[PDB]
Amino acid sequence: GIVEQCCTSICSLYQLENYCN
Amino acid sequence: FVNQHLCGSDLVEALYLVCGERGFFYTKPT
């Protein structure tokens, strides 16, 4: 669910960092 | 960079920078 949370809404780097390894 | 919209590449790109060596796995729902 990030393709929309970032493409449909906005995502903070912190939340975007939860997608790294 | 304060709140923005990302998509695929830009997503794998922002993740690229924030993750960088952390290795990021951009997923995509079909």
State both tokens at A10. Answer: 């906005």
Alpha helices in chain A (DSSP H): 2-5, 13-17
Nearest-Cα distance to chain B for A15, in Å, is 10
d(CA B5, CA B15): 12
Chain A CB contacts of B10 below 8 Å: 6
Please tell me the experimental approach by which this structure was elucidated: NMR
d(CA B25, CA B16): 9
Domain count for chain B, please give it: 1
Q: Which residue type is seen at B8?
A: G
Chain B CB contacts of A6 below 8 Å: 5-7, 10-11, 14
Q: Which domain holds residue B15?
A: 1-30
SS3 label, residue A20: strand
DSSP letter assigned to residue B22: G
